[model samples]
Target: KSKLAKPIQDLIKMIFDVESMKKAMVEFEIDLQKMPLGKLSKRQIQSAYSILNEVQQAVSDGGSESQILDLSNRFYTLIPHDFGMKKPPLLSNLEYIQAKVQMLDNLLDIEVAYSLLRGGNEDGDKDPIDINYEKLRTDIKVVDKDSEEAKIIKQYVKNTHAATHNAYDLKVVEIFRIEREGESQRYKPFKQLHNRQLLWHGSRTTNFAGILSQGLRIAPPEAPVTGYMFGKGIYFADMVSKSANYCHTSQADPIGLILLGEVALGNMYELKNASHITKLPKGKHSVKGLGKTAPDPTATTTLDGVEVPLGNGISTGINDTCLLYNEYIVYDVAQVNLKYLLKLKFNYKTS
Candidate 1:
């Protein structure tokens, strides 16, 4: 009866008192037992009290900021909020969703890196997903020391191994493109993705295996790993017209290709391979100024040795071998993860 008879001011005070009573109940429970939250039913009692306890403990112990900042950063930290999707097992059930997410992020980086690699000309018409290069370089006999390409390849391998000496394990190798042009800001979609499922199928929750055991310097420093390679390619723009011609660009520019891998800077394997293959002719620029127009070429070459006029393009169907990068790690896989294959972990402390 008094619900309506009371003035708005009194009603507000009464509501405050009721909430205070609820807080008291929660506090009473906490004071008696150390976070009886596990016993409480979902939504029956508030989650704020339990979270505050964690926050206080984290800041006191000088743990990682991620521990403290993760709390009170959002409503979900104290209250349950969903990403509007299936709530899969978290740190509890899934073991390390964060690490898995990190691994996924690493794989995504491979996609970006590979895109940059293929950004120049190969697989221009096909989507990245269809491109697979599992056995890409096997046909090429082990790099011979006599060839000029072989020498460059060996040097690149040496540099790469030197760079990533203390990084994480290796799953898959790839090359990607870094495309930057004009003052144009645009959103580009990724067409290709790394099959991480096959790559890191049995990796550790936190792996540091790739460089730890044996690395690019198989017999220690000054010695290079076996079968190292150095690849070179040109990036060209249509000099005569804006018709996407083969006009080579330098790696010095913000527009070019990059190699992708885990433990990027620390892994000597990835670094050696990338630096060796990267060819940025000094002071080179794309034909951005000569953009008026030009006629299509009279003839174009096909991958299968066919000559056709311009506008009649070739698909290069599943040229995955040429499209993707292939390399071998000098290290024994067993030392890093106790398994030959790298598995995904929740936290791969690559740092």
Candidate 2:
């Protein structure tokens, strides 16, 4: 209808949809009356993270029950979780602490999103979409669906997607070229690194505002030493399905967002089985968790200057690995340069 296309319109609606964000806190069961979205701040959530980290340490050390409860009350008091006046559960165990840490992470992001939504007051004459997008601090432009770049990305998604079980359905809603302010300069130092390639990262919709503003980051210090699946590093997957699974969507609501970050993995430290890695080897730049299946190296190609592993899926003939697909992790944030953001329609199977 307007000059803006439907996908961008849908994307804008998806990102700025405060209603969906409401569902996030609602999903977490945060009491809206005690700590409203407009009233939440980064300091408050950071404090909660510290509190949970304390509980994590306290529980791990088998601290006295009464002492741990004191710490637990502080967290409950901080966020005021919605429990309907019933007795609150104790943060006396690792499970509770980890769960709260996750909630606090969401709160940190959602707080910023709400702040951005309310903070933009500079231009009253701008369109609603422009006004909303101003908060992202990242320039996101639509890639023409019929253009060559989109063709390449689509091929990447389709080929990589089919390489998997192919149990679900996929329809790429749109492809976007990201030019986050200061991102290029941030990645300038690593620009000359070797073995660079585009990779995928799937995240929740509620976290996009924070992600767009803050860039991809590692689990914070407030998190446990072993917070991430691999380690305290940024994770990416060469195959779309591997990352797309992180979207955590349901059959009823199948729409999800995934990112394309160009990672400069100069030298990789390959692992066949699970390992909690705090640091890469002396000369290694990244960690690659090898998988049973991978794109055919014969079909590998590139777009622009970075490598593209859009090859059809093939057996790596690796019978010893625990993972189905390869996972790539980078210790340095600058090693990754944000490239594209895609809106996808995940069709789930009923059978």
Candidate 3:
């Protein structure tokens, strides 16, 4: 009555201050106390107080009943189910039912107000239960390029692109490494290697029976085993060469051969062999530990006397062998995860 005339206030009350509205608010408050939202962040507290002030101002304004009702509804909506907490529980069964009814009433009032302003036909068809299909936009609207929504969407796309872009993806492949030789021989995910733990101790690569002992190494710099290379194929190699180099020197040594193989992502270890193999022209290579036993096409090729098996992927065994001329070999492996590759290419301008 203090905010608006009795007749108008009564009508507003009929819709908003119904039993449902009271029920909703009671349950909402009980939830708040149960959640005990006492220790709110400064920002959250400020927001709450500011909203309350707005509601007070809206109710004090005698001229605009609409503004008062809108503000009141908004305030009710602000109370979240999970935002606050309190003791074991509050509000009895009767209180819960009444509050629920109050909430329904408030919602019904909001729906009726919305319909009165923007819905219905000439016959005064403003029933709250009637669905307002006409209010929905059936056709897509042409967005202005310079509009705020467009700008926001554009920025969001750029952010997403940066997240999974090719450059970043390649960098991921670039940094991936595997510890091949030591007891620590396992795939090191990017983060584990990046962290670079120091002074860590663990069991030796081989069991030194009876006495409980462990192998140790100061944060040794690891070597890359797999990733995108200068050409079209995925580059990988047996861990032996990479790990063997560590014996002579504590520093990283390039594997004698960087085998470029075409293996599907899913079929990485399952294929167990190469589809085809051809030796490229012999040329002076920068990598150390070059094949001492010159390329032998007639029989199985030997790298420093160890036979390298041809027509197969890198063999994982104590004495693996290969047969190939002293030249770069290429294999046509199956393709997998094509969609991911395409997405990377589309976003990153890579061929």
lDDT of 1 at 71: 60
Task: Report the C-alpha lDDT of model 2 over 28-145, residue by residue, as the tens digit.
Answer: 8888878777878777777777777777777788888877889888988888888887888898767666677767767777777778777765755676776767667888889998
Provide the lowest-lDDT 10-residue window in model 1: 190-199
| Residue-wise C-alpha lDDT for candidate 1, range 116-195, written one tens digit per residue | 33333345554332222211110111223466533332222222221122222222111111112210121111111111
* Stretch of 10 with least lDDT, candidate 3: 336-345
Error of 1 at 90 (Å): 10
Give TM per candidate.
0.18, 0.90, 0.15
Alpha-carbon runs more than 4 Å astray in model 1 = 1-67, 70-82, 85-118, 122-351
By descending TM-score, how would the candidates be arranged?
A: 2, 1, 3
Candidate 3, residues 1-351, lDDT tens digits: the string is 023334322322332223432343344452444323232233433344344445444444553666655644554444444334543222222333234333332333333333332434344444332222122211112334476534432332232222111232111111101111222222223112121111001111111110011111111111111111112232222222221221121112111101111112211222222322122224311111122122122333332222232211222232322321111212222221000000001112333
Steric clash count of candidate 2: 0
Candidate 3 lDDT score at position 57: 43
TM-score, prediction 2: 0.90
